[PDB]
Amino acid sequence: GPTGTGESKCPLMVKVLDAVRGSPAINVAMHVFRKAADDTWEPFASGKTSESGELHGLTTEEEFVEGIYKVEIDTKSYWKALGISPFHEHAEVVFTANDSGPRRYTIAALLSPYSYSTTAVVTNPKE
Amino acid sequence: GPTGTGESKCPLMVKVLDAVRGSPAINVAMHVFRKAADDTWEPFASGKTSESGELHGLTTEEEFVEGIYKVEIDTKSYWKALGISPFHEHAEVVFTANDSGPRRYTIAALLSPYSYSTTAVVTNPKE
């Protein structure tokens, strides 16, 4: 079930790909925020992508309550590190989570220096 | 377009397309912000896409100085009018505007209910 600050059924996963190199985007920083009652963004979780370009264990079912979340992906530092000066400061994904019960969320991002695409895969959890 | 203190020399243009229907995304709101001293976001420009999914005359070359800009596109509103339940609260594009490079910026967004792609076209010539 839940847990409380780690990785329940993995309710939140992030996957980043590099469209220039045809590979996972490794060591990409990220930051997740939750909108608090006062309308500010409070820190919720952060991590870096693995060699497979994925980030797991950001949260648990218990901690991942109903709310508005923002996933910031630090695309700028990734590209600079490669010798490329990209267009965007970062990629942001803002969505309401769990408003009709708990769901599992996969945020995928595909990166190019002047372009990014993002998609969400939402699953009604556990089989 | 005209000019003065921001609004029509076409240094900045937004184009929004709908991938479900294969058309321009019309009457989409957006809002442009410029980052200020205090690291907060100051209103800068706003409008709604036209019949061709475009927004022009947001600023002028005199007003468009070097800085960090954020373009926020009200995608949630668009999909709700179509009776489709979207994933994203909105789409956000954050970039640095630099005098060195080309002077005309085209920001294009391709919208789907659970996905969006954004690209920047930076040029010397015209749109």
Ligand SMILES: N[C@@H](Cc1cc(I)c(Oc2cc(I)c(O)c(I)c2)c(I)c1)C(=O)O
């Ligand atoms: N281990 C995770 C990793 C993973 C998720 C997705 I979602 C995916 O599919 C796409 C398709 C396109 I097109 C993209 O631009 C991107 I990024 C990801 C792929 I490959 C791998 C999983 O499988 O659970």
Ligand SMILES: N[C@@H](Cc1cc(I)c(Oc2cc(I)c(O)c(I)c2)c(I)c1)C(=O)O
């Ligand atoms: N009247 C404007 C309309 C317009 C501008 C662009 I730039 C464009 O090109 C792309 C390509 C892809 I691929 C996208 O996902 C998107 I959104 C836009 C298209 I089509 C139409 C003009 O012609 O001036």
